[PDB]
Structures are given as C-alpha cells and as structure tokens.
C-alpha cells in the first residue's frame, strides 16, 4: 500500500534528477560537425550453402572466420576470405536463435527453442567437432549467447532472466533478474565487466557481471527491444525495437541522447551494431535492407540493399574492414 | 588456391557441400505441421503412430510415401509473438478442440482468432480437429449447450450443436485464400492420419497453383 506510493515518488526523483542534467541535445552540440557523406558499400562475398533461413551469425576475433546458424539444423563455420567451409556441425535441435564464437577461437555455442545452450569444441584431438557441454536450467527459449572466456558464458532467455555460467562444472554461478518480459538480446562491454540486455517490456538495463546487481535501467521505447550493442568506448549503447526506431543511451549520463527514426520507415529493427570508430550505426530492418545511420547526427548515410527477405543478423569485424548480414533467404553477404 | 595446402582445403570445402546438399535431399520429403490447442484437448494422441523420437516436442510418423513432422509448442509459457515466426514455413496448422470442456471453449476460440489472423500465418491452411464426439453427445443431454453459448438458438440435438460450434470457429477466418478442413474424431478412430494426408494434398496443390502463376 504505502510502498506503492514510495515506488511512485522514487520514480519521480529519478525523472527529476535525470531532467536536471539534460542541458543540450546531442544534435545541438554536434550541429557544426561536417557530415560523413554518402557511404557506398558494395557486396564482396556471397556465402551460400545454407538451405533454411539464417537466424544468427558471429565474427571470430581474428576477423576472418565466420559462424552462422540456420533453421535446417546445421552450424557452419566459413572462411570469409576464400568462401570455404571450414566446419559444418549438425545440431540436435533444428530450432536455433543464436550462435556465438569464443574469443580464443576454440569454442562455439548455440541455442534456441530447446532451452539448452550447447557448447562445441573445435580444437579436438580426434579431428571432429564434439559437444563438450550442454547447459540447462532456463525454462524458456534462449535469445543470445556471449563468451567471456574459454570457461564462462552469459546467456539470455525468454524466462525474463539472464545468467552467468561456469562451463567446466556446468552450474549457474550467478542469475540476474528484474525484467518483466522476455529478454531478446545482450552485448558484453569491451572490458567484459558490464553488459546490457534489452527485453520485450520496452526497457534495457545495465548489469554488474561480478556483483550480480542491476546498476541502471533505461526506458523510452514504445515496444519490445530486438537488438542492442555497446559503443566502442564502452560508455554508451544503442537499441533497436519494433517501434521502427533506434536510440542511443549513455551510461554516465543515464539518459537517452538521440533517436534514429525516419518517416519512411515502418517495420521493426532486427539487429544493430557499431563500426570500429563508432560513427556509423548499422541496423537491419524487416524491409529487406540495412540502413547506415550517422550516429552523431541522425542522418541516413546509405543503404545496404540486398537479400530477398528479412535481415536477421549483423556483424562488424574487430578490425572494422567489413560487415556481414544474414537474412531469411539463406544467404550471408559480406559488405566492405 | 595456388598453394598445395590451400588446394587440399578446397577439397574439404567441396566434400562438405556435397553432404549439405545430400542431407537437404534426404530431408526434402518431410511435411512440417504445427500442433496447437488448449491443454487436455487431445493434442497428444491425434495419431496412434507416435514414435516421438521441457522445450519443444516433435513427432515424426510416416505414411503413404510422405514424412510427417508434428511440432508441439505447449509448455513454452512465453509470449507467442516472438517464437511464432520460427514456424512460418509449416505446411499447415493442426488445431485441436475439445467439445466436452465448455469452460475452456472460450480460451480455444481466442487462440484460434490470434493464430488465424497472425500476419505470418496469413497463408497457412488450418486442419481443424473437433475431438471427443461421444463425450459431447453424452454431456449435451445433461447440460444444454447454452451456458457456454447464451446466444445459441437452434435445437438441443447433436447434429445442430456440432454444426454450430464449427461455424463459430470458421467465423474467425475474416480473410480469403485461407481454407479450413474441419473434421470430427472420436477416441476410437484409427483413420486420423488419412485425414491429414488428403488435406495436406489439397494445401500443396494450392501452393503450386500460386508458384506456377495460374492464380
């Protein structure tokens, strides 16, 4: 009863404190920065070999190997430069909605409607890929996976909860809660000490990996959040939603800096990623396109017109030499 | 590919493609059907040839030179809107309804409206199953079909009641190009697969008519 009033007034204090800091908009400070021009990027590779639709993709740390997960129950590891197929791993469950490549390149992870985050070992003595561990404990589908080291993985489920695992033992070291809806994505901070997660309840929150506590929560979206990624310097992140808009939040400021909505855009975002410098914000919509946004001025700097169906994943190499996109038409295209 | 090793790497790539292509062929004659409905609605015993195999449960019975896969998504306990797009390519949606559960009837109706009107399933035919005729026939005598449907006006006879319940389910179509193959089944009904098989034939013929340009 009274606590409800205490909850309401607490929100007001945060809103009041949030408003006091706001002095000038991002577009108002950077209005005299010269534009970036028209970014023309032409397809360089066309990785084909998938039969069904493609639902996830991740770049290796060395910017050459790829991993893509499709609905046909195959997990392929591509050689970007030569378009060769290094590996092709059969999956127990054909329903997959994520895939992750370990930083060291020794492991690769997968998951989906089976509520199990499988980990495969690639540098095996026997020369074939084997399932080292099967992580269970989530009561709903699995949305995103990310490696912290060779013995630690952070996962996001539709149970409204994320977790931090210990691959060796197989248990769930720390569990994060606080969301009121399905968690649809997450991204790890560059220093791997914080990470953010956007849920279907139209809000993203920042989490302390070591401590297991929610340090912040961000609002502003009118609908569910489909993708999220950190700014390269680790002090801001951008979110994509079904509202047909992307937004840029700043952790230190604890607010929303800019919006990337356009009158001509009607469908929802499916993926988001930044470039190495952090000046281009690439998002893939359901109109069969990916739009490049000038992250500092909210100007469409170009379009990556390709694919015959929805774009389901995006990726930017750690060296920043290329961009890869996957779509339901069962083709990955590397754009340079 | 000039180098000696890089040549051997290229073989491995071609050998992998061969297995990916061949597995597609071996997995081309399988028809994917989605199972839906309320609980205790017979969604687990539609066909007695189960051969099953928390999460997603699959059943892969085969019949008449065709491989049928039924996917049961019960137990997700999540918001359908986010995993429904996974089954966008299923041939048909197999819906189950229990005529003996008046209280659950409205829940079933609500589900049908959303499934039939979902933007992804704007083109997938629905194979409607109405289960437990005998229990329906026995229960109607003791409790008239008015408590669940106060708007009902026809007689209290079996044929009219079963006909009316079907119409309500069909009344949620509200769209063309999508057809519903309603059927009535009992507990002791062996020929359930035959009904799926024939109805699947008509759905496929409808698609090829779209692809070939005749429509």
């Amino acid at each position, epitope marked *: 009863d009274q606590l409800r009033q205490e909850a309401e007034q607490l929100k007001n204090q945060i809103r009041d404190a949030r408003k006091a800091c706001a002095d000038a908009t991002l577009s108002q400070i950077t209005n005299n920065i010269d534009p970036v021009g028209r970014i023309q990027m032409r397809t360089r590779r066309t990785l084909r070999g998938h039969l069904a639709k493609i639902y996830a993709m991740h770049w290796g740390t060395d910017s050459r190997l790829l991993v893509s997960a499709s609905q046909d129950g195959k997990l392929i590891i591509w*050689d970007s430069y030569t378009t060769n197929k290094v590996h092709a791993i059969p999956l127990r469950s054909s329903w997959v909605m994520t895939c992750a490549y370990a930083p060291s390149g020794n492991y690769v992870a997968c998951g989906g409607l089976d509520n199990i985050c499988s980990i495969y070992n690639l540098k095996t003595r*026997e020369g*074939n890929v084997r399932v080292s561990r099967e992580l269970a404990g989530h009561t709903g589908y699995l949305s995103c996976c990310r490696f912290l080291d060779d013995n630690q993985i952070v996962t996001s489920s539709g149970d409204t909860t994320c977790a931090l695992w210990d691959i060796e033992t197989g248990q769930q070291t720390t569990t994060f809660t606080g969301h009121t809806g399905d968690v649809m994505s997450l991204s790890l901070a560059p220093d791997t000490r914080l990470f953010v997660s956007g849920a279907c309840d139209a809000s993203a929150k920042l989490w302390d990996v070591r401590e297991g506590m929610c340090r912040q929560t961000f609002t502003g979206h009118e609908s569910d959040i489909n993708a999220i990624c950190f700014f390269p310097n680790g002090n801001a992140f951008a979110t994509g939603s079904d509202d047909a808009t992307c937004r840029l939040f700043d952790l230190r400021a604890d607010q929303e800096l800019m919006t990337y909505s356009h009158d001509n855009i009607i469908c929802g975002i499916t993926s988001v990623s930044f470039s190495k410098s952090g000046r281009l914000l690439l998002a893939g919509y359901d109109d069969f396109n990916c739009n490049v946004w000038d992250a500092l001025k909210a100007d469409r700097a170009g379009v990556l017109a390709g694919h015959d169906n929805r774009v389901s994943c995006l990726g930017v190499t750690d060296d920043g030499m290329a961009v890869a996109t996957g779509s339901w038409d069962s083709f990955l295209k590397i754009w340079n | 590919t000039l*180098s*000696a*090793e890089e040549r*051997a790497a290229l073989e491995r790539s071609k050998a992998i493609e061969k297995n990916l292509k061949e597995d597609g062929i071996s997995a081309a004659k399988d028809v994917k059907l989605l199972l839906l409905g309320a609980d205790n609605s017979g969604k687990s015993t539609i066909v007695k040839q189960m051969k099953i195999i928390t999460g997603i449960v699959e059943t892969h019975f085969t019949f008449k030179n065709l491989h049928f896969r039924l996917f049961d998504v019960g137990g997700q306990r999540s918001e359908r809107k986010k995993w429904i797009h996974c089954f966008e390519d299923v041939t048909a949606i197999i819906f189950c309804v229990d005529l003996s559960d008046y209280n659950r009837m409205h829940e079933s109706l609500m589900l049908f409206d959303s499934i039939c009107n979902n933007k992804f399933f704007i083109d997938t035919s629905i194979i409607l199953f109405l289960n437990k005729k005998d229990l329906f026939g026995e229960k109607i005598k003791k409790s008239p079909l008015t408590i669940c449907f106060p708007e009902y006006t026809g007689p209290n006879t079996y044929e009219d009641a079963a006909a009316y319940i079907q119409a309500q389910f069909e009344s949620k179509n509200r769209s063309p190009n999508k057809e519903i193959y309603c059927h009535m089944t009992c507990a002791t009904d062996t020929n359930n697969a035959q009904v799926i098989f024939d109805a699947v034939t008509d759905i496929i013929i409808a698609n090829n008519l779209r692809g070939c340009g005749l429509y």
Partner: single-chain antibody
Amino acid sequence: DVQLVESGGGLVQPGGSRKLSCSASGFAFSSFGMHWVRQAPEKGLEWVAYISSGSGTIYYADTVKGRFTISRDDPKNTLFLQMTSLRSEDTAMYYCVRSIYYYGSSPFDFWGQGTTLTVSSSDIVMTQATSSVPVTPGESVSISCRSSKSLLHSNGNTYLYWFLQRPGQSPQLLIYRMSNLASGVPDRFSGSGSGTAFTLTISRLEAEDVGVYYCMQHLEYPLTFGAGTKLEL
C-alpha cells in the same frame, strides 16, 4: 587415445611384392589425409605417397611412381600401400602419418610407430649445413636450414615444418608453418625465418631434447625433407 599401428614388413626377395597395412583407431579416420614416409637405415626421411580424404587426390614421389600404389579403406579404418617390384633401394622403415587440411590446421601432428622392411641384396632442395651440434643442458641452441625457392607465398603463410626424432622413436611435430607451436610441446621452442632462410631456436635445453631435427617444406609436391641435424649431449 589416438593410435596408428602398421604391419606387413619383413624380408622379401628382389622383385617380390608386399602389402603394408596401417590401421588407425582413435579419431575420425574418414576425414584425414594419410601420408606414407620412409626412412632408409640412418639416412633421413623421404616422402613416398599421399592419399587425401575420400581418395579424391593421390600423389607419388618420382622414385616410386608406377611401382607403388596407395589405397584407403574408409569403413574398415585402414590404409594400404601395395608395392609391386622392390629394388634394393626400398629397404627402410615406413611410417604412417596423418594430415587434416583446413584454415589453421596442424597437418602432420601424429606419426605412426612404423614398420621395418628389408630387401635382400624441378624439386625444391632443402639443406641443413651442420651435421652435428654438441651442447650441454641449459644452453641456447640454434638450428638452421635453407631452401631453393622462397617458401613464402602470396597468402602470407610460410610453409615450413620442423620435426624432432628422438632415439628409437617416431618423429614428432614441433612447428607447423613457421612459428606456430604444435599442441603438446613446451613453449621453450621457437621458430623464425624469411623467404629462404629459417631457424629453430631452443631456450633452456632439457635432457629429453637430444635427437635429430628435420626441416620439411609443404609448398608443393613432392614433399622434401632436410638431411637432418643431430644434437649430441
């Protein structure tokens, strides 16, 4: 554990024929290219034949073309070498070696234990200048070997391999392209080079490192080994 065992050698009369069998157990034999490598009595390794995965490719060294034929039996997990007419030059110990080729692979990691064969009585040339190098434990050592062409390729990968043969055992891989340490070896080993001159350097020499070192090129067939350098304690 991975294991390759060979059999079928012995004493044969000149012009006779024999069949050597190499039976694998402990890995996905169907996915590995298998080599045959022979070592005449205290002379040095010499490549013989190679059959790829799926038997799609086959090669032979000029010394044995036509007389030797190589075959693989995938379902049985076995490798066969059929020798038709044997001269007195073919007496040697034959090794069964495995190789898997893909981006970032280690294509000679394991060697068989080998079988003894006795017979009763254009190419890149790699040279190892020094034949012996006495040394005591704890002293830095260096081993170098030259080449005819520049092994450096357009890809940027220098195709050179360093093998270590201990007394009485089969060789063991150390460095597979120019500087990558093969899995299982101590980090003390290192390798470097440029184009046509290469060197292997050892720090904190141990008592188990005494043996013979062979430098091999994999740029293009036929594969060629160096004469070999011996370390004496």
